[PDB]
């Protein structure tokens, strides 16, 4: 389904209802909760979200690039293509990027699948690689894009952005990118949906002052004291002057809402019996987000130079921080011109303004509590709450929460909403969910807990119930890395279902939000430790030690194999002892290669999508010891990672990938 449009409404404009929204919005949170609250029995619905990047491949000019102008494929595969999804089960919408699909099942997966999830995710990449080589054929007759070779590719970052000639448009500085107002990303990189460079303008207002991402470089030999890239400019004021005083030597700097949600991610969504069940799986989600992330990491390099960390979470972090000097605690950069550190908060409430930690985008915040092993102590970090909003939750007359449940509503809401349109100033509580969606979803976290509608209500079986998103996941080049991934998640949400008695995953959130710290670390997977629990059979007890990701993995006691994934394909009966028995199972191989996979990564054999770039840029022949990605080495990585995406071991690179034993088996066969 592609977005709906209407009269957006710049910061100045919409900031002025900030108070009618959230207000209206806790009112439909209420309904949703009156209608759907004592939903039961839902099954167990799930999906995947995939995301991707065109990239235009100019093999003349030995040149990659981001294709900005294929974006019609969006509203193509929705409109008179929207049948050929349906026949195959496939559905596409729109991302932050012009250049960037997504796409996910038509219908929710029932239970275990099996292979199915890598089947859908193949016809998702055909479907777009047809489309493209449709309009690399009507290119060609009306002769446009010469010399070039669109492909979607599932890259996390890419890793030549806001660079020179990184987007397939002649002369982009030629006129100004008012919505960014960025030094390296030409507003084009926006996709068309008002939506989005609205959110981006909003952000920037309010904010006064870009966003601001600093990637720590890594340090080679020759490298440069500091991001040579940046520039000095006068387009733009405050923006222009800003750089000098944002930046720091040894890091990368970025300054752009694209460089993070230019990014892509795996998601998968899981629909819990009901929401009690739907808070005790969310809850129990928490800590395997920062080590999926460590685990997935394939971002190891930003704005042309090799990172010091592997993955993008903190960019994306970054790339939409709506806040104010004031909120972060610090001095404006241009006092002059972001007055007294309130950017663009209206006067009339700077008063009311708090000192708040993390960015609305940025790791879950809040068990929800609600179960047996939940303890509020949990909660132990600093989490600023609208008291106004915990007050009404608590106190009215449709549906009176739980206080823990309430202060996560109560802290999702100390953001102001930052796009609205004009259309929707004023609905039908009882119908609408729209303007708590506007605060629900644009508080991006690590997971999500997605209520359902007013419509939902218990007869209606089929409409979505409680609803628990995993969104860390890194995105790999290859279906099966995904579906494997998507798959590992899948037994991991099943296992905590099924035992839901028996299984405390409960830990102190402060030891998540390091370990969320840890998991950005070069070679992380590697060698870095993280606080995981030592016992999850175990009521009363919250002990962690630090364990490696190869222990987190396979350790007998505390295991994600031996206390997650072994035990439900017991109960399933895929096997009798082990996981390993698949590899000799007739109904089951697929599955033992996906967990085969993520073992041999986990435990270092197998390297991450991103050692295997980083290795790659570092070996490259035109590397210059500098962390410095040039057209070149881009060009060549990516027609690596094009001929891996199809299994291509003409040039042993697919064995080199994933090792022998795998590039063997996934190349002589394919998915169900
Ligand atoms: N009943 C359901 N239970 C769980 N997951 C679902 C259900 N219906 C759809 N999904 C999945 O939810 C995800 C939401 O898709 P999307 O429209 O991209 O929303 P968002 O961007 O909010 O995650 C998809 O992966 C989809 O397949
Ligand atoms: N692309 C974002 C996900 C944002 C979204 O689509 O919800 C990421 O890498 O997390
Ligand atoms: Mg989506
Ligand atoms: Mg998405
Ligand atoms: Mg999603």
Same mark, same amino acid.
């Given at each position: 389904?592609?977005?709906?449009?209407?009269?957006?409404?710049?910061?100045?404009?919409?900031?002025?209802?900030?108070?009618?929204?959230?207000?209206?919005?806790?009112?439909?949170?209420?309904?949703?909760?009156?209608?759907?609250?004592?939903?039961?029995?839902?099954?167990?619905?799930?999906?995947?979200?995939?995301?991707?990047?065109?990239?235009?491949?100019?093999?003349?000019?030995?040149?990659?690039?981001?294709?900005?102008?294929?974006?019609?494929?969006?509203?193509?595969?929705?409109?008179?293509?929207?049948?050929?999804?349906?026949?195959?089960?496939?559905?596409?919408?729109?991302?932050?990027?012009?250049?960037?699909?997504?796409?996910?099942?038509?219908?929710?997966?029932?239970?275990?699948?099996?292979? !199915?999830?890598?089947?859908?995710?193949?016809?998702?990449?055909?479907?777009?690689?047809?489309?493209?080589?449709?309009?690399?054929?009507?290119?060609?007759?009306?002769?446009?894009?010469?010399?070039?070779?669109?492909?979607?590719?599932?890259?996390?970052?890419?890793?030549?952005?806001?660079?020179?000639?990184?987007?397939?448009?002649?002369?982009?500085?030629?006129?100004?990118?008012?919505?960014?107002?960025?030094?390296?990303?030409?507003?084009?990189?926006?996709?068309?949906?008002?939506?989005?460079?609205?959110?981006?303008?909003?952000?920037?207002?309010?904010?006064?002052?870009?966003?601001?991402?600093?990637?720590?470089?890594?340090?080679?030999?020759?490298?440069?004291?500091?991001?040579?890239?940046? !520039?000095?400019?006068?387009?733009?004021?405050?923006?222009?002057?800003?750089?000098?005083?944002?930046?720091?030597?040894?890091?990368?700097?970025?300054?752009?809402?694209?460089?993070?949600?230019?990014?892509?991610?795996?998601?998968?969504?899981?629909?819990?019996?009901?929401?009690?069940?739907?808070?005790?799986?969310?809850?129990?989600?928490?800590?395997?987000?920062?080590?999926?992330?460590?685990?997935?990491?394939?971002?190891?390099?930003?704005?042309?130079?090799?990172?010091?960390?592997?993955?993008?979470?903190?960019?994306?972090?970054?790339?939409?921080?709506?806040?104010?000097?004031?909120?972060?605690?610090?001095?404006?950069?241009?006092?002059? !011109?972001?007055?007294?550190?309130?950017?663009?908060?209206?006067?009339?409430?700077?008063?009311?303004?708090?000192?708040?930690?993390?960015?609305?985008?940025?790791?879950?915040?809040?068990?929800?509590?609600?179960?047996?092993?939940?303890?509020?102590? !949990?909660?132990?970090?600093?989490?600023?709450?609208?008291?106004?909003?915990?007050?009404?939750?608590?106190?009215?007359?449709?549906?009176?929460?739980?206080?823990?449940?309430?202060?996560?509503?109560?802290?999702?809401?100390?953001?102001?909403?930052?796009?609205?349109?004009?259309?929707?100033?004023?609905?039908?509580?009882?119908?609408?969910?729209?303007?708590?969606?506007?605060?629900?979803?644009?508080?991006?976290?690590?997971?999500?807990?997605?209520?359902?509608?007013?419509?939902?209500?218990?007869?209606?079986?089929?409409?979505?119930?409680?609803?628990?998103?995993?969104?860390?996941?890194?995105?790999?080049?290859?279906?099966?890395?995904?579906?494997?991934?998507?798959?590992?998640?899948?037994?991991?949400?099943?296992?905590?279902?099924?035992?839901?008695?028996?299984?405390?995953?409960?830990?102190?959130?402060?030891?998540?939000?390091?370990?969320?710290?840890?998991?950005?670390?070069?070679?992380?997977?590697?060698?870095?430790?993280?606080?995981?629990?030592?016992?999850?059979?175990?009521?009363?007890?919250?002990?962690?030690?630090?364990?490696?990701?190869?222990?987190?993995?396979?350790?007998?006691?505390?295991?994600?194999?031996?206390?997650?994934?072994?035990?439900?394909?017991?109960?399933?009966?895929?096997?009798?002892?082990?996981?390993?028995?698949?590899?000799?199972?007739?109904?089951?191989?697929?599955?033992?290669?996906?967990?085969?996979?993520?073992?041999?990564?986990?435990?270092?054999?197998?390297?991450?999508?991103?050692?295997?770039?980083?290795?790659?840029?570092?070996?490259?022949?035109?590397?210059?010891?500098?962390?410095?990605?040039?057209?070149?080495?881009?060009?060549?990585?990516?027609?690596?990672?094009?001929?891996?995406?199809?299994?291509?071991?003409?040039?042993?690179?697919?064995?080199?990938?994933?090792?022998?034993?795998?590039?063997?088996?996934?190349?002589?066969?394919?998915?169900?």
């Amino acid at each position: 389904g592609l977005l709906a449009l209407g009269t957006p409404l710049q910061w100045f404009e919409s900031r002025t209802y900030n108070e009618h929204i959230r207000d209206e919005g806790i009112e439909q949170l209420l309904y949703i909760f009156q209608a759907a609250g004592k939903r039961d029995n839902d099954p167990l619905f799930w999906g995947d979200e995939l995301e991707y990047m065109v990239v235009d491949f100019d093999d003349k000019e030995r040149n990659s690039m981001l294709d900005v102008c294929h974006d019609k494929i969006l509203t193509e595969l929705n409109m008179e293509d929207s049948s050929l999804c349906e026949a195959n089960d496939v559905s596409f919408h729109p991302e932050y990027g012009r250049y960037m699909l997504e796409a996910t099942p038509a219908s929710p997966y029932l239970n275990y699948v099996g292979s !199915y999830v890598e089947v859908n995710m193949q016809k998702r990449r055909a479907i777009a690689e047809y489309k493209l080589s449709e309009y690399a054929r009507q290119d060609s007759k009306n002769n446009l894009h010469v010399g070039s070779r669109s492909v979607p590719l599932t890259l996390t970052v890419f890793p030549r952005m806001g660079c020179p000639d990184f987007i397939n448009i002649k002369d982009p500085w030629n006129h100004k990118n008012a919505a960014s107002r960025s030094l390296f990303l030409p507003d084009e990189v926006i996709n068309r949906h008002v939506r989005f460079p609205n959110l981006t303008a909003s952000i920037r207002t309010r904010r006064g002052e870009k966003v601001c991402m600093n990637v720590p470089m890594y340090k080679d030999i020759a490298t440069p004291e500091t991001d040579d890239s940046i !520039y000095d400019r006068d387009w733009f004021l405050p923006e222009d002057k800003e750089a000098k005083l944002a930046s720091k030597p040894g890091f990368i700097y970025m300054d752009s809402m694209g460089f993070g949600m230019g990014c892509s991610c795996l998601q998968v969504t899981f629909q819990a019996p009901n929401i009690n069940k739907a808070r005790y799986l969310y809850d129990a989600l928490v800590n395997f987000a920062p080590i999926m992330l460590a685990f997935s990491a394939a971002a190891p390099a930003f704005k042309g130079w090799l990172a010091d960390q592997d993955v993008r979470w903190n960019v994306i972090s970054g790339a939409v921080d709506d806040r104010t000097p004031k909120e972060r605690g610090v001095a404006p950069l241009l006092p002059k !011109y972001n007055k007294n550190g309130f950017g663009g908060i209206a006067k009339d409430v700077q008063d009311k303004v708090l000192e708040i930690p993390k960015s609305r985008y940025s790791s879950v915040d809040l068990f929800l509590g609600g179960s047996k092993f939940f303890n509020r102590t !949990y909660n132990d970090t600093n989490v600023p709450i609208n008291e106004k909003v915990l007050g009404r939750l608590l106190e009215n007359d449709k549906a009176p929460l739980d206080y823990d449940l309430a202060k996560h509503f109560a802290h999702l809401y100390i953001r102001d909403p930052v796009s609205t349109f004009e259309e929707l100033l004023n609905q039908d509580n009882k119908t609408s969910s729209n303007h708590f969606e506007n605060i629900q979803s644009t508080n991006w976290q690590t997971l999500r807990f997605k209520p359902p509608t007013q419509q939902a209500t218990p007869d209606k079986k089929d409409s979505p119930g409680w609803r628990v998103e995993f969104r860390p996941f890194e995105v790999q080049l290859l279906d099966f890395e995904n579906a494997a991934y998507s798959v590992l998640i899948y037994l991991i949400v099943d296992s905590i279902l099924t035992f839901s008695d028996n299984i405390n995953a409960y830990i102190h959130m402060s030891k998540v939000w390091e370990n969320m710290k840890i998991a950005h670390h070069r070679d992380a997977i590697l060698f870095e430790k993280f606080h995981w629990k030592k016992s999850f059979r175990n009521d009363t007890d919250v002990e962690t030690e630090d364990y490696s990701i190869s222990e987190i993995f396979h350790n007998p006691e505390n295991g994600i194999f031996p206390q997650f994934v072994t035990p439900i394909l017991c109960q399933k009966g895929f096997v009798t002892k082990d996981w390993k028995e698949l590899k000799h199972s007739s109904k089951h191989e697929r599955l033992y290669y996906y967990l085969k996979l993520i073992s041999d990564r986990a435990s270092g054999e197998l390297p991450t999508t991103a050692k295997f770039f980083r290795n790659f840029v570092l070996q490259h022949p035109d590397y210059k010891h500098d962390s410095k990605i040039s057209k070149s080495i881009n060009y060549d990585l990516l027609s690596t990672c094009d001929r891996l995406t199809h299994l291509d071991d003409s040039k042993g690179e697919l064995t080199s990938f994933l090792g022998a034993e795998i590039a063997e088996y996934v190349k002589k066969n394919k998915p169900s």
